[PDB]
Symmetry: D2
Subunit: 359 residues, 4 copies
């Protein structure tokens, strides 16, 4: 268990950006700029800094050339400069490795703290950032698939309750989760900014980064991303979807960048800012929990995720999940799922929905 520090948690506003290590910067640029239409805040031969349509901070995504594709940092903005000091004292009390840079780790960020957190993830906390032109009314630039906000991160970790408790002490509030009747937790979603999630935990071998999620305005914008990928003959890089989520109620799509980093496109979840916001727990065997329409969850969604780096830039050792596997209990040979709880009609045993088994 991870103890609650005496020191106050930093006041976290929201997820703000991710730094991803990529192996071929030009191929990654093609994906994020030419395919997905993100906006360049800065670039050179080593890095590309990208932002969404409605953003005013310097960036939502930094692509950094390196030898091994991995998550380098997932960054949260905090409310005040003093909250960076609070973050440092908090993670020091947790016994975590920290590194403080008064002029930032990446361009367009000022005083910043990076930590190897108790779950092995590289978190950054910062307040100071260079403001840029907010493009929210630049409809002369608007793409049919425009990505308008950074919405959330999702992390793979082996013990979800342990991670959940730690994030709760850090001020995140749980909105939704997936459990079974004999007390296993498979996933949890948690927020600071008044949407369903700023980060989320997926049970599995970790630390690994499951995905980074961007929003669109409308569902048709997500459809267009799929259509464009078909036209570019890269439909093999559409991993899963499009769909409606059960958990979060958002319309969604998962796609894979050139290094296999997973990107979710997302829209139209609900407001969670009231302190008594009702939590929702789904049963793991409910075949509408992940895709509301009952479409099968592609197996790579459960098995594949990105490496994460420590503060020296080396890959973090993976620790194996010992709790039950969501894949195995739902779509594996001994798994099952239901459409209506207790009804054999519309249930699936030893395979996925819609007539498929695992390949």
């Amino acid at each position: 268990e991870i103890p609650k520090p005496v020191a106050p948690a930093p006041d976290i506003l929201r997820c703000a950006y991710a730094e991803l290590v990529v192996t071929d910067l030009a191929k990654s640029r093609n994906f994020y700029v030419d395919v997905l239409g993100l906006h360049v805040s800065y670039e050179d031969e080593n890095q590309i800094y990208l932002r969404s349509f409605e953003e005013f901070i310097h960036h939502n995504l930094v692509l950094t050339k390196g030898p091994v594709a991995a998550l380098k940092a997932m960054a949260f903005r905090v409310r005040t400069p003093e909250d960076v000091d609070k973050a440092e004292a908090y993670y020091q009390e947790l016994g975590c490795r920290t590194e403080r840079r008064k002029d930032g780790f990446v361009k367009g960020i000022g005083d910043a703290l990076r930590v190897e957190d108790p779950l092995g993830f590289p978190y950054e906390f910062f307040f100071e950032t260079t403001h840029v032109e907010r493009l929210h009314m630049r409809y002369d630039l608007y793409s049919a698939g425009e990505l308008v906000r950074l919405d959330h991160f999702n992390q793979v970790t082996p013990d979800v309750p342990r991670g959940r408790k730690y994030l709760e002490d850090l001020g995140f509030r749980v909105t939704e989760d997936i459990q079974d009747d004999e007390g296993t937790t498979y996933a949890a979603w948690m927020h600071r900014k008044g949407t369903v999630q700023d980060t989320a935990l997926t049970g599995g071998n970790g630390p690994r980064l499951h995905h980074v999620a961007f929003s669109t305005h409308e569902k048709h914008n997500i459809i267009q991303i799929c259509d464009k990928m078909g036209a570019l003959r890269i439909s093999d890089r559409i991993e899963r979807g499009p769909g409606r989520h059960g958990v979060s109620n958002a319309f969604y799509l998962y796609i894979l960048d050139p290094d296999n980093h997973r990107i979710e496109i997302y829209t139209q979840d609900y407001y969670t800012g009231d302190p008594d916001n009702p939590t929702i727990t789904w049963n793991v065997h409910d075949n509408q929990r992940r895709d509301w329409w009952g479409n099968p969850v592609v197996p790579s969604w459960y098995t594949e995720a990105s490496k994460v780096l420590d503060l020296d830039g080396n890959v973090q050792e993976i620790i194996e999940r010992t709790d039950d596997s969501e894949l195995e209990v739902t779509i594996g040979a001994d798994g099952f799922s239901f459409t209506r709880a207790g009804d054999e009609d519309g249930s699936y045993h030893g395979q996925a929905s819609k007539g498929f088994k695992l390949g």
Copy 2:
């Protein structure tokens, strides 16, 4: 080969309605009226007559109670009264059984001809029909999932080229087809009204009715049907989709009625009314041909379809397809599909796309 008659083909306007035999009229009403929102033109203890939002003829769908669920008639409207006589002479020349009723077979249709066509399907030709209130601006009635038009039928038949030639002689023009490089045709689409299809042929054991398709205005209307089916906890009745088709370029969904009759929801195909409209041939191994995003085609889509009746009300005998199976050559154990022609990367050998095998 089916010969071209000397007698002139009737001038067919469009698909107009289907008559489906259903086993439980109330259960069927719940699906088509309460779930899908079709508009009742007439009903009694034996039949329900339904129409789409923009229709002015009496109905697009007749549900008739009977002992064995089946297609009873797929009806095409012809341009003039005299075209019903032309239809009769044409099919008599073809050696087909015909039945003429001056006051119709169903309510709201006048003089009508039903035939057992050379592929064993029950076709109706009529001109006369009772006009009803066209609901096209009745936005006080408009559903978030509103079905606005009848679009097409799709027929399963064992020998696609044989059927195609017959339909071309009858005046349908082929818009798209699926073939391989070994001379096999797997499917064809053909039209009279200015859209991709009024009917279509899917290779398989037949005669069977694959589906009846209705249009929506927009893609979000199809999304809503999925969402509603999730809320009603009948997502098991979503067979396949939603998706973007390769062939037709339409956004689509396939759902199953209480008797397992398959309904497609469809929008935003293209204009085909010019007589030299370019005919598009897709390769059967192209994994973007059916779902442009590369999502796998559910196996029941290839195997399951509705019985059809002869003019005596008895089920037509099924003739087995001897040409290659689209399922087998694409997603079966010796199948193959590609994302990019000539690229091993993004190809699938002996399984479906997105990580699945046949259940």
Copy 3:
């Protein structure tokens, strides 16, 4: 009265393209290509040939540099080469000037007939056209405002019944019209291809070209055009809309090109292809007939329209309308409109709706 020829009418398929004379080819290119996203089939120093997303014929719009901005030709495609001969015989019997060129008047059109028609309009009829890449699945090119089809023309002419009879003899079928209770006709809509219109007549001084209309897939595509024009700070070139039409039921927008040629953007009218398609007549004083939401029709919509050329390239003389003016009887100082017939509440006397008078 324009007499009905003995000679048969050519079988007209659809509206196909317009040739507009523009004064500054680069400024016009910026509007049609950069702002509106139409696709270039061919260009040089004198002409730009443009097509919509789903078109396979060579072009839908030819911009020709010249001294006076005007319609040079409105072109309809006919069913067969022999229909060009029929068109020549038909217009010769009407006593109209004709000009036939076996190799066309513009690039990408073959054997073509241009005529000075009985209403003074430069019509072209052609069958032969160079096929080009149909861009209907080129979602890598798809704009958030994508124009997908050419839909119709709209002509200003002083005597609507006279023009209507002539177009009916030519094979166009009236779908909707606007009249009053004193026997005046203000406008009529008429089709060949099975949508509400291929051309339309607006009562007014003429011959003048009121607009050319292009379709989008969805309503949000029309909204985007507005949004983009706001971002480009050219909202002054949004003339009227966006709205829902009463007549046609289509979602719409009117914008102005650099020479003040009016372009409509249009979507989601209804099917008219049955020969007994019900006609709809609106009263001119019904304030939902042009904008279903009751928004006022901007006065320039009634007063402004483009010059048209004769076959020698000179502007056609304008003949004044003597029938009552739709502007005057609805929104002028002695005008009237209603929301509900017979109800003083929601009616407008001597002013437009929503609190406005004419500027």
Copy 4:
């Protein structure tokens, strides 16, 4: 000036509900339930309690039968029970009349404080509320025009800077405003929940309630409300729109209920939750500030608004604005607006845009 209390401000979460007095409860029910599709949380012969699709608190709107149509209370939810005490001490220090009811003023609200605030408005502050079924995934109940959240209030007050400072002291942060070069403020928008606004100030005679605003998911949902009002032949109750706002960037519509209370329908503004969220100031003469497409602002929008009640149920005296009138300076006889600053082309002098003058 309204001095800042030494007592701490209550921690306000968001706008939560309005209580409107209506004169004919059944007619009001028709509008809000049958036309707009709001969901009933409770009703009797005197009151109707309504909520939006995604709400979990008891209601977002209370309709109360009474003799004079008016705003009875605009309610904000506070973070904790203790914040109701804080509100009481805060307004007592300001010298305002307050009333505390430990069991609430309306059903489904617990301990609540109502105040006659320094601008004459009846504010309520509460924490405790009865949770109800959150309908966010009840797609079986979803309307084509579904209202999904309560978004904001908008208040008419004569001195915008005076009101702005008072609301800033209360914790609201300004996101956008409208000013001129002479230093007049015409309007300001301010938030607690991390959208553009929870309440807003429009310069004018007050206190009056300008509107209550509900969100939709998508722009097409707003279009449907218009279309439905057309079909119900109540387009005269569409006051203004639909449009895109400049200020807020939201897609919008204004409609009028049976007592002329104005309701805005709204979607797709941007995130404001960072503490240094950039504040946007628009010039009053910018014709894209209110409608981004330059459509004219209906004069009733500037002149008409609802009465508000004091705590005895009597109408508050209305104080006239002495600062310049936005109507007069933009669309009145001595007003002007521009499309591009400094360009006479696309400017309007002594009249509105798009060819209209004041009726």
